[PDB]
Each structure stands twice: as structure tokens, then as C-alpha cells.
Structure 1
């Protein structure tokens, strides 16, 4: 296929056009008073959304160079959201600002590598300042407070989140499932969660939020790397006859008779999901055996001669539900026997006591934690159905916010933290002049979120930015109530993880954007 190649200024201006289109699409949905974006679905009536990621998903330009310029920003900005729970729009706005300023500097003719180094230095210093400004949130009162604030000031959601955290532990696994009535329920069911996302994104279930759920699935434990379909056929027929979902944790499902075929051909015949075996080597085998004990299944290992051709439905495991997202995978509640699971935990604890190096100690401690800890499940309930679904949505939003807060603390939101750290990092200087200009670019681009929020509200960005910068500490501006004060007290806060991740990822996007020299793409 013939390629189209561009160098120098043309490549950078095409990239800038793409990033500008994407940012102008997503920046208008930022802030408590964001505008609306009319997303179009060819089926019927259009979709009105104030959500940033929903808008960013559809954006795909015509021109190939601009399309790539938008795609890189969208990709490396989605990491902030899927690693912190929010910040896609903030990361995109920061990336747009840094990219446009750096590209103008490069067009002015200054060493791009020095600019990238200066931007990285400024971002590192800003991250340190954000760590300095964080307000710790570990007590149950603070946990409940953040839970309420995230879920539109609903005390019941905060109470439920606090109860779940004190039951399963601050580092434990919490999942919110459906409910049966007005009352909400909480229970610690036995389960585990390992960080292996879906193989193919087309495995996505009905939820469009990058999630897959399988009610009463089948767990197949193939420790070896599976590539052929013929020895799958007995298990496929058994699972089809049973009708329950089928989840295959395995060493790796390759681009062979599996994966590719399972995506399209099994798209709507038997519901399935694909995840890799957690760990590697002996760790992978141990994970396989623990999952077999948990889900009541048997490990089909070729090392002792057992062959996936003969895999009875009894060898298959099953649980109440399994949730597979982009990176993690949780088993809610398997059908394993509590006595057998307890015995396995006991023997692994013995292995802990007779461990040799600290590495073995910590890995086996993780084993016993995942085994014995279990999974706490919140059963959100309400009066009507729609009330139920809306409250459930509020619940997982609050859960993600609370997890981020208890991880890295909480800082004033609404873009005030970035403006504060940018104001305090005024004396930062680099070796050469280009590094200094890069520091200036990063510092000025840290003001984009607050300015865009104020502009979305319809006020004058400059006056509000000056007033907020003139203050100190957590003093900022409430875009909702158009008043000034300590953003923490008045209920406008943000987890430190979200802001730090957004800033760092935007810096990475800008660094990769500025130092580019050539783009190769297929011609129209």
C-alpha cells in the first residue's frame, strides 16, 4: 500500500488541527455548567450528552494526518480515566494547551528536546507540589464525606461506601450489584480479582462503559497456552447445552482458531469472555490452582497429561457473576467449598511461614489476601426501577472517587489545585533558555482547566483567574454558586490521583507531540 509522508511543519500543523478539533469537541463539556454536545446515532433521534468521554469516543476526523493527531491524544488521555476514574476532559484540555504553545515555540525555532525536558521538569515539580497540598482522607468520617460529595451530596451513598470500606478493608475489593427492593444490602462473599483485562475489545458485553458481566458463567482453567479450536469443541458444546456463560482464564489466547473466531463467529451464539492467566510461570500456575479451588473447577494441565479434549462440565467452574473491564477481572462469588478454600489458604499460609526471601513473603501474602479477603458486594436498592439505576450509577461514581481519595488524598477541585501549584512554581528555572520557555509553557497551560470552566459558565476567565491566583491555600472559585471561598469546605474537591494522572499523561502526550518529525500514513 502506497504511503503518504510528511515532515517538519506540515506534520505538526496537521497534528495541531486534529488536536484542536478533538479538544474543541470535548472542552465545552467541562465544569458544573458545561454545554451540550449533539452526538448523532444513525438509528433514530440524536443523543444529548454533557459527558466528555462519550463525546471523545465518536470523534474521528476525515483527513488521515489530523485523524492520527486526534487519535494519539484520545488514546493517551483515556489512561487517566481508566486508571483514576475521571480526568479525560482535563487531560485533553491540558494536552491541547501544552501542544499548541510548544508547537508555536518550535515554529519560532527552538530545540524541541530542550522544550520537552523543561515541560517534564515543570510537571515533576507540579506533581511534588500537588503531593504537598493533599489533604489526607483515611478516617471513616472523611471516607463518608468524600462518598457523599462525589454522589451529589447523598448521605446514604456515603454511609454505604463507608460501611463497605470498613467491612472489606480500605484496600479490599468492593462491587455494587443490583438489588431487590427499597432496602440496600451488603455482604462479604468469597471471591478474587486479578489485573488481567479482556483480550479483544469486541468481547464487550451490553454495558458500554468498557465492562463485561457474565451472570452464572463457566470457568475453564487451561494452564497451557491455547491456540486450537478442535479440543475446545467438547467444552463449547457442553457450555452451549448448559447455556450459561463461559469465561476462559488461560495462559494466552492467540490470534488463531481462538480469539479471532471467538470474536465474530461467537458474537451472538454463546456469550463468552477472554482474559489471560494472572502472573507468569510458577506464579501463573499457582493463580490457576487458586482460581480452580475458588470456582470449584479443575485445572486442565498438560504437564500431568490431562488434555483439553476431555473436559467435563464438572471441570468447569461457576460463580454468581464475573466482571471484566479494560485491565482488571473480578470473580464475585464462586461455588467453591468453604472448607477446601480454607484449607488452601492454610497451606499457602504455611508456605508464607517457610518462605525464604522477602519477595516470596510478599507474593504469598498477596495470595492469602486475595484468597481469604473475599469480595464485599453492595446491593443498591430504591423504590422505582429508574431511581434504582440512577442511584447505582451514582454509587459506582462515588466508589471510584472514594478509592482514589483513600489512595492519594483529596485536593481542592474545579481546577484550583493546578492554578495554585502553577502560581507557587514561579521561580522554576532550567539550564538553557529553551528549558525555561518549556517551564513557562507548562505553567501557563496549567491554567487551562479553570479558564475553560469559567468560560463555560459564561463569565470572564481573566478576572476569575486573577482573583483565584491572588488568594492562597485552597481558596478558589465555585463555578456552580459563583462565589469564592475554601473549596474544601464548600464541597468542591477532587482526588489527588485524578489531577496528578491527568497532568502527567497530558505532559507525556505533549512531549511525544512536540518532538515528532515525520508522519507516515496511507494516502487517500
Structure 2
């Protein structure tokens, strides 16, 4: 009724099962005709979170007892190195487990076979030199700014009609970013409005919060205040306890003390000419009445992540206790206002003196699938930063993968004894990628594999898998390219996570009913 009970060879199967379950969900995602899945959970989860990107969803949740979470964690380091485009690295590791059925048939030492991963070490190198043509991306780049790799990341995604334009916008963002800054202070949010452009570029920062129903609608020549400590006051670290006293006047004094906090906030707020107050946490009610009459707009529970970027942008400030206003606070001033984007209320910070950090605001159809824009968008910013830095790329659509696969078949026969079995199993691992790209396309996977191998074997590097075509075609015309870095790291990365899987095999549970 529950049984379980796994030993030695069946123990191995638990490693096997984890790989097959993950592969089916992720396979649909890779390629232009991608698929969207929604996940719901309760208990510290609100509802219906859907992620197209395989890396974000696996990383967030550790659903069950079988081991697989450690493999998932590793993908993020890859993400940091370069990461994305389409999520293909996890699938490659999963298929490597299928050969292990063969290993029981081999019936000698499975660890000797482990030499195959070491063998894979220069297999990676073989693909590091012979693959694609397309290098540098000089600087700023007129035409070559995009209409390339960001588009390929998008090609897998289904929003690529209007969206390819959005992608084009993202490289403009990286050009300003470019410098000794590295990769910081860029935030982009979607909006429920409908426009052909579906996106806008903001010179400053965008936030979605309001002081309350009352307060002036707009502020000019605004001063910005950011406070680490909340407006709420009464419970310090040690209470001073709960006490009685004994007079008909003393209980009144504590209420009076509250007024003093109110007094400091208004009198010095006015000297500064403060137009907006932003605090990352809860805000005490008393000051709120004060802000409305004064003509000062404040934000309750503003997110910290938005605040830190904003600080670099406005010159920053020293966020301490109420002494915080005046000189210790740097306030840039152009326009802070709630702007009618089209459908909803937003607050715009703009005209930043620094210029180092800028914000992009997206507009879309609406309903969690517009979150798709965040999904594509997250991928867009990161890909570009290394495309310029790496100074080289390889052909996409699996063109790179089939070529290496043809080369590795030769290698297995060449290695003596034990090694040839191990090396050849690694070699067909490359074969599934063409199959995965074709499968989500809906075209028949079996036919696709055979036709593909003949074109790569012939000697044309440009030729690859064309999903729209339903056969093979010229990758370069499409503009699909993969970062050279994604290929170097993935080959090194797949082996180490997969290797962990063979070395485990034993999971222990005790007894019946």
C-alpha cells in the first residue's frame, strides 16, 4: 500500500526516476513552439505561479523525498556564468542515465565507466574549437546592437511577435549599463495597458505605492527621503515594562510623547521642502495626517530592492534616525508623480543626475502571461552583458550539438577496453538535444534525427534544426546564436551534477504498516 523498499540496483533507479520526471516538463519549453505550465501551492505560497524558465521554478521548490534538488541548484551557477537562452542543460544530464540500463548488461565495474565523464572533458574541448563563425560585437553597435541572440532566447517563448521589439529595447539598456559598473541597478516592470509599442523607457525609477487616499496628487522640485527605521515608536529593546503609575494625569503624558515624534517630522520636513518620503517597512498612522496638510507625499512599505537602486541614482543618503533629513540626504529633483500610463496607477522618479542607472517599463495584454514579459526580460538583460564581454558565439538551433556528436562516435572506438563503452554513452547524449528541440515543435522526432545527422556530417556548420521548416535549414539567416560561454560551461557542468547521481543510489527507509 506504500511499501517502497529499494536495494542496490533498484536503488539506482531512484536516481533514474528523478531525471525522467524533470525532462518531460522541460522538453516542451525548449524552442519557438514552447509551452507554459502553471504551478499552485499553499502555505507560504499565494497561488498560480507559472514559470517558463526552467531554472527559476526548480530552484524555488523542493517538492519531494527523491534526490534532485542539488542538481537543480548547480544550474544557477551556470546562469551566473552565462546561463540562459533556452533551458537545455538539465535535459542533457537526464538522458545520460538511460545508458546505465546498458551498464547492468555490461556487468563489470560501473565506476570504470565513470572515466567517460573525464573522457567528456576533451569532448567539450573538441566543440570549443570547431563549431561556428560570428565573433566580437565591437561597441555600442548600430545594427548589431540586437536582432540577434536576445531574439533567439525569445524565439522559444510564444510572445515573439510584439516581443521581438521588446528584446531590441533591452540592448539599449545594456549600452548605458556598459562601463566599470559591471551589472547593477536595472529594474523593469510590466503594465496592464495596451499599446503597439508595448514598452517604454524611463530615465529614472518606477514604483507602485500610495500614501493614502488624501495627500497632494503631484510634487515638483521634489526632495526624496529614505528611512531604514520605521515611523512606528513604543517598544525599543527593553520595554520599561508595563506599569501602573498613580495619577489622573500620567497616562496622558505617554500620549503627549507621541506628539513629540509628530512635531519633529513636520517642522524639519518643511525646511527641506520635502516632496516625497520612501520607507522600507510599516509606517505609523500619526505622521500620515500631517503629510496631507503639509503637501508631502510618502510611501508605505516601499520595497528595499527598489530603494537601493534609487539611492545610487539620486546620489544617495545616510539612512539613520530622524536626524536623516537635510545635508545627509541627497535629493535629486526633476519630476516625481503618479502618471496615467494608461490603465493603472504608478509613481515615476525621473531626471536622475547620475545617468548610470536607468529603468524600462513594459506594457502588455494582462493576466500572469504578461509576467511572461518579466520571464523573457530577465533573460534579455543578462545575455547581452556577456555577449559583448565574451567576444564570440556559436550557431544555435542545435547546430553545434550535432557536429560534436558526429565527432564523438569516432572517439569511442579509438579508446581501448573499458573506456570505449563509457565514451560512446556520452556521445549519444548529444543526440537527444536535436530530439528535444524537434519534439516541442510537434514534428516527428525520429525522422528529424536522421535527416539532421547527414547535413552536419557533410560539413556545413550553418545548417541545423529548423522547427518552423519541419526539417533542416540555415541557422545564420534566422539570427539564432548561442554564447560561446554557455557551451564551455555546460559541458563541464553536466558531468559534475550527473556524476553525483551515480554515486548516490542508496536511500534508506525502515518498515511496513
Normalising TM by the smaller chain, what interval? 0.5 to 0.7
How many residue pairs match? The answer is 380
Alignment partners' CA distance in 1, 2:483 and 2:55: 19
TM-score, structure 1 length as denominator? 0.58
Alignment partners' CA distance in 2, 1:185 and 1:443: 46
Which residue pairs with 1:297 in the alignment?
A: 318
Contact 2:85 2:379 in 1 (8 A): no
Which residue pairs with 1:420 in the alignment?
A: 403
Offset, 1:412: 2.0
Contact 1:380 1:388 in 2 (8 A): no
Contact 1:410 1:495 in 2 (8 A): yes
Which residue pairs with 1:133 in the alignment?
A: 131
Which residue pairs with 1:245 in the alignment?
A: 280
Deviations 1:78-108 (A, max 9, x none): 4434553426842221111112214642563
Offset, 1:394: 4.2
Offset, 1:245: 1.3
Which residue pairs with 1:92 in the alignment?
A: 90
SS of equivalent residue, structure 1 residue 31: coil
Alignment partners' CA distance in 1, 2:416 and 2:225: 62
SS of equivalent residue, structure 1 residue 145: coil
Offset, 1:422: 1.7
In structure 1, which of residues 440, 451, 454 is the aligned counterpart of residue 435 of structure 2?
451
Alignment partners' CA distance in 2, 1:24 and 1:373: 47
Query: Matches of residues 80-479 of structure 1 in structure 2 within 5 Å?
Result: 80-81=78-79, 83-86=81-84, 89-102=87-100, 104-105=102-103, 108-130=106-128, 132-134=130-132, 135-139=134-138, 140=141, 141-146=143-148, 147-151=150-154, 152=160, 156-157=165-166, 159-169=168-178, 172-173=182-183, 175-178=186-189, 184-185=200-201, 187=203, 218=227, 230=237, 244-245=279-280, 295-297=316-318, 312-314=321-323, 375-380=356-361, 382=363, 394-408=376-390, 409-428=392-411, 432-471=416-455, 472-479=460-467
Alignment partners' CA distance in 2, 1:137 and 1:123: 26
Q: 1:520 to 1:184 in 2, by over 3 A?
A: same
TM-score, structure 2 length as denominator? 0.59
Structure 1 spans left out of the alignment, 5+ residues: 190-214, 221-228, 232-236, 247-268, 275-289, 299-310, 318-333, 339-371
SS of equivalent residue, structure 2 residue 358: strand
Which residue pairs with 2:339 in the alignment?
A: none
Q: 1:382 to 1:431 in 2, by over 3 A?
A: closer
- Larger radius of gyration, structure 1 or 2? 2
Structure 2 spans left out of the alignment, 5+ residues: 155-159, 206-223, 230-235, 239-257, 266-276, 282-299, 306-310, 333-352
Matched, 1:504 2:502: no
Alignment partners' CA distance in 2, 1:48 and 1:295: 36
Structure (1/2) with the larger helix percentage: 1
Offset, 1:454: 1.6
Offset, 1:419: 1.6
Alignment partners' CA distance in 2, 1:25 and 1:388: 21
Deviations 1:4-47 (A, max 9, x none): 99663232112212322222333333332245546445699977
Q: 1:108 to 1:30 in 2, by over 3 A?
A: same
Which residue pairs with 1:52 in the alignment?
A: 54
More displaced 10-residue stretch of structure 1: 44-53 or 448-457: 44-53
Contact 2:29 2:35 in 1 (8 A): yes
Query: Matches of residues 486-505 of structure 1 in structure 2 within 5 Å?
Result: 486-505=474-493
Alignment partners' CA distance in 1, 2:407 and 2:325: 59
Alignment partners' CA distance in 2, 1:273 and 1:6: 48
More displaced 10-residue stretch of structure 1: 504-513 or 121-130: 121-130
